[PDB]
Design a protein around this ligand. Sequence first.
Ligand SMILES: [Zn+2]
Lengths: 241, 95, 123, 107
Amino acid sequence: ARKGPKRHLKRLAAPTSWYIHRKAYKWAVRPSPGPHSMKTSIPLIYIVRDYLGYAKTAREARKILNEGKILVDGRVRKDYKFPVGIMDVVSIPETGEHYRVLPNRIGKLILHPISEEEAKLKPFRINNKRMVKGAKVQLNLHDGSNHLVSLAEKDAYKTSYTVIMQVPERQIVKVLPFEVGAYVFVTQGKNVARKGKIVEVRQFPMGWPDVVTIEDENGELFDTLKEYAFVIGKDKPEISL
Amino acid sequence: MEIKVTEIRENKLLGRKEIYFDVLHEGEPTPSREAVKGKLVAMLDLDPNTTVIQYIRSYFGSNVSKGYAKAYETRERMLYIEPEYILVRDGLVQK
Amino acid sequence: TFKLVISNPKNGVAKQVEISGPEADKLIGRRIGEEIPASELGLNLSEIFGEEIPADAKLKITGGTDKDGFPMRPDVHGPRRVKILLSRGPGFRPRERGERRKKTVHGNTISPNIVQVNMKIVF
Amino acid sequence: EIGLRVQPPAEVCNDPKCPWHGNLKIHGRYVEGIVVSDKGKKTVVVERQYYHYLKKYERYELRKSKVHAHNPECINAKVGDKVLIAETRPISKTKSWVVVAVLQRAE
RNA sequence: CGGACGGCUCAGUAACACGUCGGUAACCUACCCUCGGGAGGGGGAUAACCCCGGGAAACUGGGGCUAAUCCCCCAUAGGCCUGAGGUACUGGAAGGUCCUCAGGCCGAAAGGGGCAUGCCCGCCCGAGGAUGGGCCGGCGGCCGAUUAGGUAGUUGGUGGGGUAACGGCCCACCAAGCCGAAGAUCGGUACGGGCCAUGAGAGUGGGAGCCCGGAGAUGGACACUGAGACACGGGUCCAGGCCCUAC
Ligand SMILES: [Zn+2]
């Protein structure tokens, strides 16, 4: 009978969304709590050691991280347990490399290379809105982060809109609304990594969530959850996919 | 015995060149680390020091063995990054 | 036979001496926290202790130890033994936070089972 | 307006254990049934029938499940009536459901 | 700061224990992330160390001296309760959050360290997330009638206490309900599943070794410290056994 929290992870019990050889060893790195969930994130050491290849062993990877050479959303990260997730930007300036973290169609996490001009912006989905002391408004975003806005400009922000920001400084630019011609990317579910344009939104009673109907390039229509629909543009992707 | 490079990569974060080469030895035994390093540097214009061979590996019946080496810029970084057992195995260092 | 450890704070020094007879029989029944005039026990501080000590001096009882090696504790009355659950001393050095043990100690009161006594001078 | 779409009662309740006009919250599932007992004070027992499939024999068997539910005064339901119930927090040892509406009374 | 994980075993348990779908608008959470703000003024002791020791050991007494991110106080921020109003937010649904007033109780912080002429590591308050758990419900999973009636805080209500929190969880008062031949209660047997063995299949039988969950640490009870234990290399008692002993 357990008397307290876990500190170990068996490699067969690790998330599906990882590229990981499950039978090679017994243990896996257990992720520390932080910006994303366990089902939408991977530790840095796996990126530095397995996805890219700049290290063969964990000691080498840890030395790289402690020398201060990997940035995530423009911030130095030295903990090997730090979780990297969807829409995060990974940067290596000694090489000039810049990647965006996204999901596959199977549901696994991949690195898409991008340019230095687009490695300065990151979108955030608004998940909730609160009033906080001083009659101010707090926006609670999809990576668990928070941002403050005033009363006067409160109606410009809603709970499935998207906000594009300069990341190390966190300055807002180009609010994108949830609408009926908006361009959407899917993050979870059976239709993960499909894209298209919103066609319709349906609501249900007694706590059941809302569903969105989408049209893809070829004209095929499909459905998913509104909380799984990530707005990235009005009619054209503001970022590369 | 002859050598044939097959892939070079540069690691700027660790500061080294990773070199995958083939070795050809027909009717001969598996060559020695000394000879392999000698020919490697004599060909690619490297300093013998600052260079470590990780492995030479032979396969079932091939006469073609595989090898992997690491070329460093400075001996300080070399010794701060590499573990002592391969340095002792090559001979750069005494216990 | 009672051994005495006589302490002078003014310098921070201590001397051990032996005692037997009526001079010892006088201590019995006396509790910790009581003052005695030295001479009554048949001793003098000047010679054996140190340089010079004003007369009318008074020895004060502070503790001691018995045959088997168990200490006295002031808040336990009587001349007899006890086993009690302790969180701090005297009689117990905890060694860990929130730790408790059942130690045996001697009471507040002197009795012939005692061996050594600890006396402090009050000026 | 409690989340479920039905015609609320025609009387104003003052009881904190009433969804309509009170503080008891409903969240989760909703099912229909038929009252079997009305003897407890503010308490009703509800039944629903369902068929369970047996694989080896390729056939079905009928089963009956019972549920104990809170019955408020503004919504006073007696034996024989068809009724809708909803899940909430624990009210007693055996009651965690509340009546929301009577669909068809009995005689 | 950690030692509450890892590791071992299947005695007990026919149960919301397990499996699956859901819920908590009825709850806690050190380490981590983001944002928004703070670090004011005063005190104290004691281990090491020195002088004496006691005891067979296990262990342990007195006196002198001295530090801190050790301990304490004052203030200010802040937290909780209640009453009266307003109507900014979220949500399917609110006195849940926000604003104003009032009466009160509790009550922070290490401006510490390193470098160097601003940076790195840390301290406290608030809002949210994450991680890890607690609690609730619907559905599903062995044998026996040479076991037929069982239940008395038992079933429910009103009002309270206690809890981190809903709750007969516990209390005072009022009633007579709850379960059952579609098998209650009682007894027997057994950790549950993913899975495994076999067979053309339908099916029959098993569930030690790997993963997830549960329970236990001679038997049986009870507590301290801590974010988290009634604690697997810790504590107290009874039973039971074993060992050292100058008894
Ligand atoms: Zn009403």
